[PDB]
Coordinates of C-alpha atoms (C1' of nucleotides) in Angstrom, one line a residue:
Chain A
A444 CA -17.7 20.3 -47.9
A445 CA -16.1 21.6 -50.8
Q446 CA -18.3 24.4 -51.8
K447 CA -18.3 25.6 -48.2
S448 CA -19.8 28.6 -46.8
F449 CA -17.5 30.9 -45.0
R450 CA -18.5 30.6 -41.5
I451 CA -17.7 26.9 -41.7
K452 CA -14.1 27.8 -43.4
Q453 CA -13.4 30.2 -40.5
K454 CA -14.3 27.6 -37.8
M455 CA -12.2 25.3 -39.6
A456 CA -9.2 27.9 -40.0
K457 CA -9.5 28.2 -36.2
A458 CA -9.5 24.4 -35.8
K459 CA -6.2 24.2 -37.9
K460 CA -4.7 27.0 -36.0
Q461 CA -5.4 25.3 -32.8
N462 CA -3.9 22.1 -34.1
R463 CA -0.6 22.6 -32.4
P464 CA 1.4 20.6 -30.1
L465 CA 2.7 22.1 -26.9
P466 CA 5.4 24.7 -27.5
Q467 CA 8.7 23.3 -25.8
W468 CA 9.6 26.7 -24.1
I469 CA 6.3 26.4 -22.0
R470 CA 7.6 23.4 -20.4
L471 CA 10.6 25.3 -19.1
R472 CA 8.7 28.0 -17.1
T473 CA 8.6 28.4 -13.5
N474 CA 6.0 26.5 -11.8
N475 CA 4.5 25.0 -14.8
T476 CA 1.7 22.5 -14.8
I477 CA 0.8 22.3 -18.3
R478 CA 2.6 19.4 -19.8
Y479 CA 0.6 18.1 -23.0
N480 CA -2.0 19.6 -25.1
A481 CA -5.2 18.3 -23.4
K482 CA -7.6 19.7 -26.2
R483 CA -5.7 18.6 -28.9
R484 CA -8.0 17.4 -31.7
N485 CA -7.7 15.0 -34.8
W486 CA -9.7 14.7 -38.0
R487 CA -10.2 11.0 -37.9
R488 CA -10.2 10.7 -34.1
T489 CA -12.7 13.2 -32.8
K490 CA -15.3 15.2 -35.0
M491 CA -15.6 18.9 -34.2
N492 CA -19.4 18.8 -34.8
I493 CA -19.3 21.6 -37.5
Chain B
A785 CA 18.2 1.1 -9.1
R786 CA 17.1 -1.8 -6.7
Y787 CA 17.5 -4.8 -7.9
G788 CA 15.8 -8.2 -6.9
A789 CA 17.2 -10.5 -4.5
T790 CA 20.9 -10.9 -4.9
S791 CA 23.5 -13.4 -3.4
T792 CA 26.6 -12.9 -4.8
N793 CA 29.9 -10.3 -4.5
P794 CA 29.3 -6.9 -6.2
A795 CA 33.1 -6.3 -6.9
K796 CA 33.2 -9.7 -8.9
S797 CA 29.5 -9.4 -10.6
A798 CA 27.9 -7.4 -13.1
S799 CA 24.3 -6.6 -13.7
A800 CA 22.1 -5.6 -16.5
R801 CA 18.3 -4.2 -16.6
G802 CA 15.5 -3.8 -19.0
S803 CA 12.3 -2.1 -17.7
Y804 CA 8.8 -1.7 -19.0
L805 CA 10.0 -3.8 -22.0
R806 CA 7.6 -4.6 -24.9
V807 CA 8.0 -8.4 -24.8
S808 CA 5.6 -11.3 -23.4
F809 CA 6.0 -12.0 -19.8
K810 CA 5.2 -15.6 -19.7
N811 CA 7.5 -16.2 -22.7
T812 CA 10.3 -14.4 -21.0
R813 CA 9.8 -16.1 -17.7
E814 CA 10.2 -19.4 -19.5
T815 CA 13.4 -18.1 -21.4
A816 CA 14.8 -16.5 -18.6
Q817 CA 14.6 -19.6 -16.5
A818 CA 16.3 -21.6 -19.1
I819 CA 19.4 -19.9 -18.4
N820 CA 19.4 -19.6 -14.9
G821 CA 22.6 -20.3 -13.2
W822 CA 24.3 -21.1 -16.7
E823 CA 27.6 -20.2 -17.5
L824 CA 27.3 -17.1 -19.5
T825 CA 29.1 -18.1 -22.8
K826 CA 27.3 -21.1 -22.8
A827 CA 23.9 -19.5 -22.2
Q828 CA 24.5 -17.1 -25.1
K829 CA 25.2 -20.0 -27.3
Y830 CA 22.1 -21.8 -26.3
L831 CA 20.0 -18.7 -26.9
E832 CA 21.7 -18.3 -30.4
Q833 CA 20.8 -22.1 -30.9
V834 CA 17.3 -21.4 -29.7
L835 CA 16.8 -18.8 -32.3
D836 CA 18.3 -21.2 -34.8
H837 CA 15.7 -23.9 -33.8
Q838 CA 18.3 -26.5 -33.0
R839 CA 17.5 -26.3 -29.2
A840 CA 14.1 -24.9 -27.6
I841 CA 13.3 -23.2 -24.5
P842 CA 11.5 -25.5 -22.1
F843 CA 8.2 -24.1 -21.1
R844 CA 7.5 -25.2 -17.5
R845 CA 5.1 -22.8 -16.0
Chain C
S769 CA 0.2 -51.3 -3.4
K770 CA -2.1 -53.4 -5.4
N771 CA 0.4 -54.4 -7.8
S772 CA 3.5 -55.1 -5.4
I773 CA 1.8 -56.0 -1.7
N774 CA 4.9 -57.6 -0.7
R775 CA 7.1 -54.6 -1.0
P776 CA 6.8 -51.9 1.7
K777 CA 6.0 -48.9 -0.4
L778 CA 5.0 -46.0 2.3
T779 CA 7.5 -46.9 4.7
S780 CA 10.2 -46.9 1.9
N781 CA 9.3 -43.7 0.8
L782 CA 9.1 -42.5 4.5
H783 CA 12.8 -43.9 5.4
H784 CA 14.0 -42.3 1.9
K785 CA 12.4 -39.0 2.8
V786 CA 13.9 -39.0 6.4
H787 CA 17.3 -39.7 5.1
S788 CA 17.2 -37.2 2.2
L789 CA 15.6 -34.6 4.8
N790 CA 18.2 -34.6 7.4
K791 CA 21.1 -35.0 4.8
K792 CA 19.7 -31.5 3.2
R793 CA 19.6 -30.1 7.1
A794 CA 22.9 -31.3 7.7
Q795 CA 24.2 -29.9 4.5
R796 CA 22.6 -26.5 5.5
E797 CA 24.2 -26.7 9.1
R798 CA 27.6 -27.3 7.7
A799 CA 27.5 -24.5 5.6
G800 CA 26.5 -22.3 8.6
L801 CA 23.2 -21.0 7.1
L802 CA 21.5 -22.0 10.5
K803 CA 22.0 -19.9 13.4
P804 CA 24.4 -20.6 15.9
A805 CA 23.8 -21.9 19.6
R806 CA 22.4 -19.7 22.0
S807 CA 25.6 -19.8 24.1
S808 CA 27.8 -19.2 21.1
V809 CA 29.6 -15.8 21.0
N810 CA 28.1 -15.3 17.4
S811 CA 24.4 -15.6 18.7
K812 CA 22.2 -12.6 19.1
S813 CA 19.8 -14.3 21.6
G814 CA 18.7 -11.2 23.9
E815 CA 20.0 -8.7 21.7
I816 CA 18.5 -6.7 18.9
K817 CA 18.2 -8.2 15.5
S818 CA 18.7 -5.7 12.7
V819 CA 19.8 -6.4 8.7
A820 CA 20.6 -2.8 8.5
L821 CA 23.4 -3.0 11.5
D822 CA 24.5 -6.1 10.7
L823 CA 25.2 -4.8 7.0
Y824 CA 26.7 -1.7 8.4
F825 CA 29.4 -3.8 10.7
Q826 CA 30.1 -6.3 7.7
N827 CA 31.1 -3.3 5.6
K828 CA 33.1 -1.6 8.3
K829 CA 35.0 -4.7 9.4
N830 CA 36.2 -5.1 5.7
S831 CA 28.2 -11.0 -0.7
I832 CA 24.7 -11.0 0.2
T833 CA 22.7 -8.1 -1.4
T834 CA 19.3 -9.3 -1.0
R835 CA 19.9 -8.0 2.4
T836 CA 20.7 -4.4 1.5
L837 CA 21.8 -1.2 3.3
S838 CA 20.5 1.8 2.2
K839 CA 22.8 4.8 2.1
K840 CA 20.0 6.6 4.0
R841 CA 20.2 4.1 6.5
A842 CA 23.9 4.0 6.7
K843 CA 24.3 7.7 7.0
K844 CA 21.6 7.5 9.9
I845 CA 23.6 4.7 11.8
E846 CA 26.6 6.8 11.3
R847 CA 25.2 9.5 13.0
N848 CA 23.7 7.4 15.6
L849 CA 27.1 5.9 16.3
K850 CA 28.7 9.5 16.6
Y851 CA 26.0 10.5 19.2
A852 CA 26.9 7.0 21.0
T853 CA 30.7 7.6 20.7
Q854 CA 30.2 11.0 22.1
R855 CA 28.2 9.7 25.0
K856 CA 30.9 7.2 25.9
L857 CA 33.3 10.1 25.4
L858 CA 31.4 12.0 28.2
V859 CA 31.4 9.0 30.3
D860 CA 35.3 8.5 30.0
Chain D
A22 CA 13.5 -11.4 41.5
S23 CA 9.8 -10.6 41.6
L24 CA 6.9 -10.7 44.2
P25 CA 6.0 -14.3 44.9
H26 CA 3.2 -16.1 42.5
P27 CA 2.0 -19.1 41.5
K28 CA 2.5 -20.8 38.2
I29 CA 1.2 -18.6 35.4
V30 CA -1.4 -20.8 33.9
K31 CA -2.9 -19.8 30.5
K32 CA -6.2 -21.6 30.0
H33 CA -6.3 -21.0 26.4
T34 CA -2.8 -20.1 24.8
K35 CA -3.6 -20.0 21.2
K36 CA -5.0 -17.0 19.9
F37 CA -8.9 -17.0 19.1
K38 CA -8.8 -16.3 15.3
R39 CA -11.8 -15.4 13.6
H40 CA -14.0 -18.2 12.0
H41 CA -13.0 -18.2 8.1
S42 CA -9.8 -15.8 8.5
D43 CA -7.8 -18.4 7.1
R44 CA -10.0 -18.8 3.8
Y45 CA -10.7 -15.2 2.9
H46 CA -8.1 -12.3 3.1
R47 CA -11.0 -9.9 3.5
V48 CA -11.9 -11.5 6.7
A49 CA -9.5 -10.4 9.5
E50 CA -8.1 -12.5 12.3
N51 CA -9.7 -10.2 14.9
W52 CA -12.1 -12.3 16.8
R53 CA -15.8 -11.8 15.9
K54 CA -18.7 -13.6 17.4
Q55 CA -20.4 -15.5 14.4
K56 CA -24.0 -14.1 14.1
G57 CA -25.6 -16.6 11.9
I58 CA -28.4 -18.4 13.1
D59 CA -27.0 -22.0 11.4
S60 CA -23.3 -20.9 12.3
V61 CA -21.8 -24.3 13.5
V62 CA -19.4 -22.3 15.1
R63 CA -21.9 -20.3 17.1
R64 CA -24.0 -23.5 17.9
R65 CA -20.6 -25.0 18.9
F66 CA -20.4 -28.1 16.9
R67 CA -17.9 -30.7 17.3
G68 CA -14.6 -29.9 15.7
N69 CA -14.8 -26.4 15.0
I70 CA -13.0 -23.3 16.6
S71 CA -13.4 -22.3 20.1
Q72 CA -15.1 -19.1 20.9
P73 CA -14.1 -16.9 23.7
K74 CA -16.2 -17.3 26.9
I75 CA -15.8 -16.2 30.5
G76 CA -14.7 -19.6 31.5
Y77 CA -11.1 -18.9 29.9
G78 CA -10.6 -15.9 32.4
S79 CA -7.0 -16.3 33.8
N80 CA -6.3 -16.2 37.5
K81 CA -7.0 -13.1 39.1
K82 CA -3.8 -13.5 41.6
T83 CA -2.0 -13.6 38.1
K84 CA -3.9 -12.0 35.4
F85 CA -1.7 -9.2 34.4
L86 CA 2.1 -10.6 35.1
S87 CA 4.5 -11.2 32.5
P88 CA 6.5 -14.3 32.9
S89 CA 8.8 -12.3 34.8
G90 CA 6.4 -11.8 37.2
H91 CA 5.9 -8.0 36.9
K92 CA 2.9 -6.1 35.8
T93 CA 4.0 -4.1 32.7
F94 CA 3.8 -0.3 32.9
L95 CA 4.6 2.2 30.1
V96 CA 6.8 4.8 30.6
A97 CA 7.8 7.7 28.5
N98 CA 10.1 9.8 30.8
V99 CA 11.6 10.0 34.0
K100 CA 8.9 11.4 35.6
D101 CA 6.8 8.4 34.6
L102 CA 9.3 5.9 35.7
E103 CA 9.8 7.3 39.4
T104 CA 6.0 6.5 40.1
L105 CA 7.5 2.9 40.4
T106 CA 9.9 3.7 42.9
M107 CA 8.2 2.2 45.8
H108 CA 6.7 -0.9 43.4
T109 CA 9.8 -2.2 42.1
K110 CA 8.9 -5.8 42.8
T111 CA 5.3 -5.5 41.4
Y112 CA 5.9 -3.5 38.3
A113 CA 8.3 -3.5 35.5
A114 CA 8.6 -0.1 33.3
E115 CA 8.2 -0.6 29.4
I116 CA 9.7 2.3 27.4
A117 CA 7.2 3.4 24.9
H118 CA 7.7 3.0 21.2
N119 CA 8.2 6.4 20.5
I120 CA 11.0 7.5 23.1
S121 CA 13.8 8.4 21.3
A122 CA 17.5 6.9 21.9
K123 CA 18.7 9.9 24.1
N124 CA 16.0 9.9 26.0
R125 CA 15.9 6.2 26.5
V126 CA 19.4 6.3 27.7
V127 CA 18.1 8.8 30.4
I128 CA 15.6 6.4 31.3
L129 CA 17.9 3.5 31.5
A130 CA 20.3 5.3 33.6
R131 CA 17.4 6.5 36.3
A132 CA 15.9 2.9 36.1
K133 CA 19.1 1.2 37.1
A134 CA 19.5 3.7 39.6
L135 CA 16.3 3.0 41.2
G136 CA 16.5 -0.6 40.6
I137 CA 13.1 -0.6 38.4
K138 CA 13.0 -3.4 35.9
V139 CA 12.7 -2.2 32.3
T140 CA 11.1 -4.5 30.1
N141 CA 12.9 -3.7 26.8
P142 CA 16.3 -2.2 27.4
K143 CA 17.8 -3.3 24.3
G144 CA 15.4 -0.9 22.5
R145 CA 16.6 1.7 20.0
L146 CA 20.1 1.3 21.2
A147 CA 22.8 0.6 18.6
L148 CA 26.0 1.7 20.6
Chain E
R373 CA 16.2 22.2 -25.8
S374 CA 17.4 18.8 -25.0
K375 CA 15.8 19.2 -21.8
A376 CA 12.6 20.1 -23.6
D377 CA 12.9 17.3 -25.7
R378 CA 13.5 14.9 -22.7
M379 CA 10.5 15.9 -20.7
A380 CA 8.3 15.9 -23.4
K381 CA 9.3 12.1 -24.4
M382 CA 9.3 11.4 -20.7
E383 CA 5.6 12.7 -20.4
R384 CA 4.1 10.5 -23.1
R385 CA 4.7 7.4 -21.1
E386 CA 1.2 7.1 -19.3
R387 CA -0.7 7.9 -22.6
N388 CA 1.2 5.7 -24.7
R389 CA 0.7 2.6 -22.2
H390 CA -2.8 3.5 -22.6
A391 CA -2.3 3.4 -26.6
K392 CA -3.7 6.9 -26.8
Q393 CA -2.4 7.5 -30.3
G394 CA -1.0 10.7 -29.4
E395 CA -2.5 13.9 -27.5
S396 CA -5.8 13.8 -29.9
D397 CA -7.1 10.4 -28.4
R398 CA -9.6 11.1 -25.7
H399 CA -12.1 8.4 -26.3
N400 CA -13.8 7.7 -23.2
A401 CA -15.5 4.1 -22.5
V402 CA -18.6 4.1 -20.6
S403 CA -18.5 2.3 -17.2
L404 CA -21.4 0.0 -18.4
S405 CA -23.2 -0.2 -21.6
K406 CA -26.9 -0.7 -20.9
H407 CA -27.5 -2.3 -24.5
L408 CA -25.1 -5.0 -23.4
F409 CA -27.2 -6.2 -20.4
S410 CA -30.4 -6.6 -22.5
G411 CA -32.6 -8.4 -19.8
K412 CA -34.7 -11.4 -20.4
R413 CA -34.2 -12.5 -24.1
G414 CA -36.4 -14.8 -25.5
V415 CA -39.8 -13.1 -25.6
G416 CA -40.5 -11.5 -28.9
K417 CA -37.4 -10.1 -30.9
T418 CA -34.2 -10.0 -28.7
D419 CA -31.8 -6.9 -29.3
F420 CA -29.2 -8.8 -31.4
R421 CA -29.1 -11.6 -33.8
Chain F
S1437 CA -25.3 21.0 0.2
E1438 CA -28.8 19.7 -0.2
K1439 CA -28.0 19.5 -4.0
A1440 CA -24.9 17.4 -3.0
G1441 CA -25.2 13.9 -4.7
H1442 CA -28.6 14.8 -6.4
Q1443 CA -27.5 17.2 -8.9
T1444 CA -26.7 13.9 -11.3
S1445 CA -29.4 12.7 -13.9
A1446 CA -29.6 8.9 -13.3
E1447 CA -32.3 6.3 -13.2
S1448 CA -32.5 2.6 -12.4
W1449 CA -31.6 -0.2 -15.0
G1450 CA -34.4 -2.2 -14.2
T1451 CA -34.5 -5.9 -13.2
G1452 CA -33.0 -9.0 -15.2
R1453 CA -30.1 -6.6 -16.1
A1454 CA -27.3 -9.0 -14.2
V1455 CA -26.4 -5.7 -12.4
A1456 CA -27.2 -4.1 -9.1
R1457 CA -30.5 -2.1 -9.5
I1458 CA -28.9 1.1 -8.3
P1459 CA -29.6 4.3 -10.3
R1460 CA -27.0 4.6 -12.9
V1461 CA -26.0 7.7 -14.9
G1462 CA -27.7 7.9 -18.5
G1463 CA -26.2 9.2 -21.5
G1464 CA -22.6 8.2 -22.5
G1465 CA -18.9 8.9 -23.7
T1466 CA -18.1 9.9 -20.3
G1467 CA -17.1 6.9 -18.1
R1468 CA -19.6 8.4 -15.2
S1469 CA -22.4 7.2 -17.6
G1470 CA -23.3 3.8 -16.3
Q1471 CA -22.2 4.4 -12.8
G1472 CA -24.2 4.2 -9.5
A1473 CA -25.6 7.4 -8.6
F1474 CA -27.7 8.2 -5.5
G1475 CA -27.2 6.2 -2.5
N1476 CA -25.0 6.4 0.3
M1477 CA -23.1 3.4 -0.7
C1478 CA -22.3 4.8 -4.3
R1479 CA -19.2 6.9 -5.0
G1480 CA -20.5 10.6 -5.6
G1481 CA -24.0 10.0 -4.2
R1482 CA -25.8 11.5 -1.1
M1483 CA -24.2 11.0 2.4
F1484 CA -26.8 9.1 4.6
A1485 CA -29.0 11.7 6.3
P1486 CA -27.6 14.6 5.0
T1487 CA -26.3 17.1 7.9
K1488 CA -29.0 20.1 8.3
Chain G
rA167 C1' -38.0 47.3 11.9
rU168 C1' -38.6 42.7 7.5
rA169 C1' -37.0 38.9 3.2
rU170 C1' -32.3 37.6 0.7
rU171 C1' -29.2 29.3 -1.9
rG172 C1' -28.2 35.8 -6.5
rG173 C1' -24.4 39.9 -7.2
rC174 C1' -20.0 42.7 -4.8
rG175 C1' -16.7 43.2 -0.4
rA176 C1' -15.4 40.9 4.1
rG177 C1' -14.9 37.7 8.9
rA178 C1' -15.5 33.0 10.8
rG179 C1' -16.3 27.2 11.9
rA180 C1' -16.2 21.1 17.5
rC181 C1' -17.7 20.9 8.8
rC182 C1' -15.2 17.8 4.5
rG183 C1' -10.1 16.4 3.6
rA184 C1' -8.7 14.4 -3.2
rU185 C1' -13.8 7.4 -3.9
rA186 C1' -14.5 13.1 1.0
rG187 C1' -16.1 18.7 0.3
rC188 C1' -19.6 21.8 -5.0
rG189 C1' -20.1 18.1 -10.9
rA190 C1' -15.3 20.8 -10.7
rA191 C1' -8.7 21.8 -5.3
rC192 C1' -5.9 20.3 -11.6
rA193 C1' -6.3 24.8 -18.9
rA194 C1' -14.2 21.9 -14.8
rG195 C1' -19.2 22.4 -17.0
rU196 C1' -13.5 21.0 -19.3
rA197 C1' -12.5 16.2 -22.0
rC198 C1' -16.3 13.4 -23.7
rA199 C1' -21.4 11.9 -25.8
rG200 C1' -25.7 13.1 -28.1
rU201 C1' -29.3 15.7 -34.4
rG202 C1' -31.2 18.0 -30.2
rA203 C1' -33.1 19.3 -25.2
rU204 C1' -29.2 17.7 -22.6
rG205 C1' -25.8 14.2 -20.0
rG206 C1' -21.0 14.9 -18.1
rA207 C1' -16.2 12.7 -15.8
rA208 C1' -10.7 11.1 -14.5
rA209 C1' -7.0 13.9 -12.5
rG210 C1' -3.2 17.2 -6.3
rA211 C1' 2.2 15.5 -3.5
rU212 C1' 10.2 14.9 -6.6
rG213 C1' 13.4 17.6 -3.8
rA214 C1' 15.0 23.2 0.4
rA215 C1' 16.9 24.2 -4.2
rA216 C1' 16.5 20.9 -10.8
rA217 C1' 21.5 20.7 -8.4
rG218 C1' 16.2 16.8 -13.7
rA219 C1' 22.1 12.8 -13.6
rA220 C1' 27.9 16.2 -17.2
rC221 C1' 31.7 12.2 -18.4
rU222 C1' 32.9 6.9 -19.6
rU223 C1' 31.6 2.6 -21.4
rU224 C1' 27.8 -1.7 -23.9
rG225 C1' 23.8 -1.3 -27.4
rA226 C1' 20.8 0.7 -33.9
rA227 C1' 18.0 3.0 -30.0
rA228 C1' 15.1 3.0 -25.9
rA229 C1' 18.0 2.0 -21.9
rG230 C1' 22.0 -0.6 -18.9
rA231 C1' 26.5 -0.7 -16.0
rG232 C1' 29.7 2.6 -14.0
rA233 C1' 30.2 8.1 -12.6
rG234 C1' 27.7 12.2 -10.4
rU235 C1' 24.0 15.9 -7.9
rG236 C1' 21.6 15.6 -3.6
rA237 C1' 20.5 14.6 3.2
rA238 C1' 18.5 10.6 0.8
rA239 C1' 17.6 8.2 -6.4
rA240 C1' 15.6 2.7 -0.3
rA241 C1' 13.3 10.5 -4.1
rG242 C1' 14.8 9.8 -11.3
rU243 C1' 9.5 14.5 -14.0
rA244 C1' 6.8 5.9 -14.0
rC245 C1' 8.8 10.9 -9.0
rG246 C1' 6.4 11.7 -0.3
rU247 C1' 4.7 7.2 2.1
rG248 C1' 4.2 2.8 -1.3
rA249 C1' -1.1 -1.7 2.1
rA250 C1' -3.9 -5.9 -0.2
rA251 C1' -5.2 -8.8 -4.3
rU252 C1' -1.8 -10.2 -7.9
rU253 C1' 3.3 -11.9 -9.8
rG254 C1' 8.9 -12.7 -10.4
rU255 C1' 13.3 -14.7 -8.3
rU256 C1' 15.7 -16.9 -4.2
rG257 C1' 15.4 -20.4 0.8
rA258 C1' 12.7 -23.9 3.3
rA259 C1' 8.7 -27.6 3.3
rA260 C1' 4.4 -30.5 1.4
rG261 C1' 1.8 -33.5 -2.2
rG262 C1' -0.7 -41.5 -4.5
rG263 C1' -8.5 -37.8 -7.3
rA264 C1' -9.2 -31.3 -2.6
rA265 C1' -7.6 -27.6 0.2
rG266 C1' -8.6 -25.4 4.8
rG267 C1' -10.0 -25.9 10.3
rG268 C1' -9.8 -28.5 16.1
rC269 C1' -7.1 -31.2 20.2
rA270 C1' -2.5 -33.6 21.1
rU271 C1' 2.6 -34.7 20.2
rU272 C1' 7.0 -36.3 16.8
rU273 C1' 10.5 -33.7 14.0
rG274 C1' 13.0 -29.3 11.5
rA275 C1' 13.4 -24.0 11.7
rU276 C1' 13.2 -19.9 14.6
rC277 C1' 13.0 -17.2 19.5
rA278 C1' 12.0 -14.3 24.9
rG279 C1' 13.7 -14.5 30.2
rA280 C1' 17.9 -14.9 35.9
rC281 C1' 20.6 -15.0 39.5
rA282 C1' 20.6 -18.9 47.3
Chain H
rC1400 C1' -12.8 -2.4 23.1
rG1401 C1' -11.9 0.8 18.8
rU1402 C1' -12.4 5.5 15.2
rG1403 C1' -12.7 11.4 13.1
rG1404 C1' -13.2 16.5 15.8
rA1405 C1' -13.4 19.7 20.7
rG1406 C1' -12.6 21.5 26.2
rG1407 C1' -8.9 20.1 30.0
rU1408 C1' -4.3 17.8 31.8
rC1409 C1' 0.3 15.0 31.4
rA1410 C1' 5.0 22.1 31.8
rG1411 C1' 2.8 13.9 27.3
rU1412 C1' 5.9 11.8 22.7
rG1413 C1' 8.8 13.5 18.2
rA1414 C1' 14.6 14.8 12.9
rC1415 C1' 19.1 10.9 18.6
rG1416 C1' 13.1 10.3 14.1
rA1417 C1' 5.9 11.7 14.7
rA1418 C1' 2.2 9.2 12.0
rG1419 C1' 1.7 5.3 8.6
rC1420 C1' 3.2 0.5 6.4
rC1421 C1' 5.9 -4.5 6.7
rU1422 C1' 7.6 -8.2 10.0
rA1423 C1' 6.3 -17.4 11.5
rG1424 C1' 10.4 -11.2 17.0
rA1425 C1' 8.2 -10.7 22.3
rC1426 C1' 3.9 -9.6 26.0
rC1427 C1' -0.8 -8.4 28.3
rG1428 C1' -6.0 -9.3 27.8
rU1429 C1' -11.8 -14.8 27.8
rA1430 C1' -12.5 -10.8 23.8
rA1431 C1' -13.2 -6.3 21.3
rG1432 C1' -8.1 -5.1 21.1
rG1433 C1' -3.6 -3.0 23.8
rU1434 C1' 1.9 -3.0 24.3
rC1435 C1' 7.2 -3.7 22.8
rG1436 C1' 11.4 -5.1 19.4
rG1437 C1' 13.2 -5.1 14.0
rG1438 C1' 12.9 -3.0 9.1
rU1439 C1' 10.9 1.1 6.1
rC1440 C1' 9.5 6.1 6.6
rG1441 C1' 10.2 11.2 7.1
rA1442 C1' 7.0 15.7 10.5
rA1443 C1' 3.9 15.3 13.1
rC1444 C1' 1.1 12.1 17.3
rG1445 C1' -0.3 9.9 22.0
rG1446 C1' -2.2 8.5 27.6
rC1447 C1' -6.2 10.3 31.1
rC1448 C1' -10.9 13.0 32.4
rU1449 C1' -14.6 14.7 29.8
rC1450 C1' -17.8 16.7 25.0
rU1451 C1' -19.4 15.4 20.2
rA1452 C1' -20.5 12.2 16.0
rG1453 C1' -20.8 11.6 8.6
rU1454 C1' -17.9 6.3 14.7
rG1455 C1' -16.4 -0.2 13.4
rC1456 C1' -18.2 -4.2 7.4
rA1457 C1' -17.6 -10.4 4.7
rG1458 C1' -21.7 -9.7 2.1
rA1459 C1' -26.7 -5.7 -0.3
rU1460 C1' -26.4 -9.9 -8.7
rC1461 C1' -23.6 -3.3 -3.2
rU1462 C1' -20.4 1.8 -5.5
rU1463 C1' -15.7 3.3 -7.4
rG1464 C1' -10.6 1.4 -8.5
rG1465 C1' -7.3 -2.4 -8.9
rU1466 C1' -6.3 -7.6 -9.8
rG1467 C1' -6.3 -12.9 -11.1
rG1468 C1' -7.4 -18.0 -13.1
rU1469 C1' -9.4 -19.0 -17.6
rA1470 C1' -4.7 -18.2 -20.9
rG1471 C1' 0.3 -17.5 -24.2
rU1472 C1' -5.9 -20.3 -24.6
rA1473 C1' -10.6 -18.8 -28.3
rG1474 C1' -8.7 -16.4 -32.1
rC1475 C1' -5.7 -13.2 -36.3
rA1476 C1' -9.1 -18.9 -42.2
rA1477 C1' -14.7 -14.0 -46.4
rA1478 C1' -12.9 -10.8 -51.0
rU1479 C1' -7.9 -16.4 -56.4
rA1480 C1' -1.3 -14.8 -54.9

RNA sequence: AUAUUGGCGAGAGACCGAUAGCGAACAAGUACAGUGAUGGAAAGAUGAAAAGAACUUUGAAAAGAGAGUGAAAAAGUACGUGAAAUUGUUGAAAGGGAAGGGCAUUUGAUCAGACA
RNA sequence: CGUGGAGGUCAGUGACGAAGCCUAGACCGUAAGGUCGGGUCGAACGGCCUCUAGUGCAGAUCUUGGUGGUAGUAGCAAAUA
């Protein structure tokens, strides 16, 4: 944890950047099937296994 | 929306609906049957009395 | 019974039941909920029975709403009736 | 009027329901022979349902006649109907369920013209 | 933007009625758990107190 | 496909388990785990006598 | 000349039709699980066109009732059809520690057909 | 008797409504089943002669899914409020 290595921090940064709900303008595109972020993650709710 | 059975004139009638409504179904069936066929103002008064514990909803089924 | 062997119990209940049964039946018959006689002009014996058609002609002649006519079926009956009227128009 | 026939006797007017078709929804009313070795229905005990057997076969002189006294024939068009032109006292045309209303009025016109009896003339007609 | 908010709200119905705490709850419950069907308990120790 | 219905890793749960003894998928966390696996009667299992 | 369950490009089928066909018709080897080797799903259908219900009104709001679009909301992003189990309401009926089933008939309800 | 697909045929049925589903409305068959009426539906489907088969379920502590009674019940009484 605190006193990380950089590799872990880079993967956590990617996880933070992916911690995004769906942008609304996506839903308005033609022939859109994506409705929710199916790959959404939460810290208490599913661990990322490093 | 399609209502359930209906046996009254639509010009002289009014409808209300609540769907997917998060309240216990058994208790709601008991309280709705307590005011079936009642006069509307009398039914509202009775329900306000039920909140006030002066009268109770009879639980039949 | 075993406490009142000298009163009819089953027979009294059956008399009461037949009385109440046909009082209820006569109440239904007087309100006209029963279907009319086969010879009546209001009967449909030998003719197709349709809830949709009956509601359509009841709305045209101008309530019961458990028996409901959909706007889809109402439009279909209007279209079919236009066809039938055109057929009678070519007949006459 | 129809071709003369005796009384139409049905030796078993009730339908032969399946054994426990009433007890269970999963058991349909379509008749099935009870194949159990200890089936009281198959062993034909007293007080159980009757099973189909050839003794209930209808009279040959009357086996396919409707109560009106005609054998029912399914017609889909005028061409099918005209095969009963010479058999009008022995056959009554029934209009298939999927014939549309306009084709039905054509069929009724031809049938009345030839005198062929039509079983369900009321049909899809909502004149 | 109102249409977007309406569609986003009208989508979550099935996930909410499964109490899915949002988009991040994809916990799956197995069809049967083999530890629950212990077997023939009473010989030796058993699988739970 | 001859691998149709066979690719699953599953084994029977044994006797005395108050369940039918059909092979059930191992592992966990997927809903597929614990389900009948190989038989023709089973959803996802092989067909009886795969067409050759 | 031979082999070819791989790769690349094609053409077919008396094949399967969303519990089927590859595990995967869909952001499927995904989600998820396991320290790990590995295991591994569920999930297609509004409508021709979003025209996805402006506006009024009740409600804190979800929504409701009107209105409206649409051929049809008996198509309202729970969306083609919409079975059964199971349930609500209405109408009828039965019920003195089963219910169901067989034969027959009462009663009530319902209902088809025919012209010397 | 019934079902999926194939060859032939009825110049078969079908948006004036195919299939499907619902229906104490009807008819034929000893039966498997077949036929018709009404409602619903909305785009395909039958008869006959044949061909073919992944062809018919009440069960297998069957498989997958859904749903009940239990039941508004057990219960939500550890950590002073």
